[PDB]
Design a protein around this ligand. Structure first.
Ligand SMILES: O=C(NC1CNCCCC1OC(=O)c1ccc(C(=O)c2ccccc2O)cc1)c1ccc(O)cc1
Ligand SMILES: CCCCCCCC
Length: 339
């Protein structure tokens, strides 16, 4: 399959050029005006900022260096920046600038005004199978690209996907993403999307992302995730069992694709077999999907986010606005020398 092979060949060489010699210190905090908080995480937050000279809107992720060190995840924040800086694909959020100061780490990404997929899925209840397929096709191609680069994106979920102005996906939250040739062992991700391997503390690979896609597609088409419970311990038992129930409204094609994606045995899971990503691309649920037109973004989107100018924050929710504290002394300069 030549058109895809030469494509993925130019993609790994373009990626490694950036991976082996990363960009550092391409902007400063005082070249931006702070507007509004768009989201929060363990060690920081994402904020809508405006570049003072060009007038462009950007999403600035601010991470506190000492909070990272305290709960040892230095490697994860270093992974996040180096990968983001090195990739380039139409369904991935673009990292425009990066820098650090005495207290924080900063990643200045593109501002995607359409907001998180979570908001729109919850508002609509559930997506139709054509609508869910449109999104799923994009994740399939995004992972085909990322897995080619020996990258595992370990956190697929509706909150981690943004919908842009053309209704297409922009994957964000590369916080758990890692470059690895083979297996990895870190217990990370989100409870209801975790594959059996991770729960059972095994050395897992890219197959973990294809399980997560099964969960994502079940959630988009049903409105809720396949494995739910009050306590994480009870979610995990349900995942490790080889049992999953499907809503009656699900098509037979969808139920069959999901059984092979939500295969508890990782050696039998789609995306991780001999035929690779093609066991999914050639599955009957994707029969109507024109893969090159999805990539070239020629397909009409089943939903366009309602917003005004590029800098509108209506689709993002409100969070407490706190101070951006930058200490007069440099903290943990040694641990973040590579950022
Ligand atoms: O990524 C964006 N925002 C999101 C959408 N996903 C939902 C969670 C909140 C969030 O990202 C964060 O706010 C966030 C995430 C993680 C961490 C974090 O501390 C962290 C923890 C472990 C590993 C890496 C990390 O960065 C901090 C902030 C985002 C990016 C671009 C954009 O235009 C608009 C939004
Ligand atoms: C991941 C596809 C093959 C890479 C060839 C060299 C670039």
């Amino acid at each position: 399959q030549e058109s895809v092979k030469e494509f993925l060949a130019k993609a790994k060489e373009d990626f490694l050029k950036k991976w082996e010699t990363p960009s550092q210190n391409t902007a400063q905090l005082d070249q931006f005006d702070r507007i509004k908080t768009l989201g929060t995480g363990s060690f920081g937050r994402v904020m809508l900022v405006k570049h003072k000279e060009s007038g462009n809107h950007y999403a600035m992720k601010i991470l506190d260096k000492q909070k990272v060190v305290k709960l040892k995840q230095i490697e994860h924040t270093l992974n996040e920046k180096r990968i983001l800086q090195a990739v380039n694909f139409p369904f991935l959020v673009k990292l425009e600038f990066s820098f650090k100061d005495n207290s924080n780490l900063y990643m200045v990404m593109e501002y995607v005004a359409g907001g998180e997929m979570f908001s729109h899925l919850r508002r609509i209840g559930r997506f139709s199978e054509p609508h869910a397929r449109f999104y799923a096709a994009q994740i399939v191609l995004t992972f085909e690209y990322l897995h080619s680069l020996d990258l595992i994106y370990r956190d697929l979920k509706p909150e981690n996907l943004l919908i842009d102005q053309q209704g297409y996906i922009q994957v964000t939250d590369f916080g758990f993403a890692k470059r690895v040739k083979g297996r990895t062992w870190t217990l990370c991700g989100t409870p209801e999307y975790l594959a059996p391997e991770i729960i059972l503390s095994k050395g897992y690979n890219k197959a973990v992302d294809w399980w997560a896609l099964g969960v994502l597609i079940y959630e988009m088409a049903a409105g809720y995730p396949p494995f739910f419970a009050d306590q994480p311990i009870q979610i995990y038992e349900k995942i490790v069992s080889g049992k999953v129930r499907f809503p009656s409204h699900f098509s037979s094609d969808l139920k069959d694709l999901l059984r092979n994606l939500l295969q508890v045995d990782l050696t039998k899971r789609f995306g991780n077999l001999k035929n690779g990503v093609n066991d999914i691309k050639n599955h009957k649920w994707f029969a109507t999907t024109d893969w090159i037109a999805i990539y070239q973004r020629k397909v009409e989107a089943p939903f366009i986010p309602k917003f005004k100018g590029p800098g509108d924050t209506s689709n993002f929710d409100d969070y407490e606005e706190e101070e951006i504290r930058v200490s007069i002394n440099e903290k943990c300069g040694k641990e973040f020398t590579e950022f």
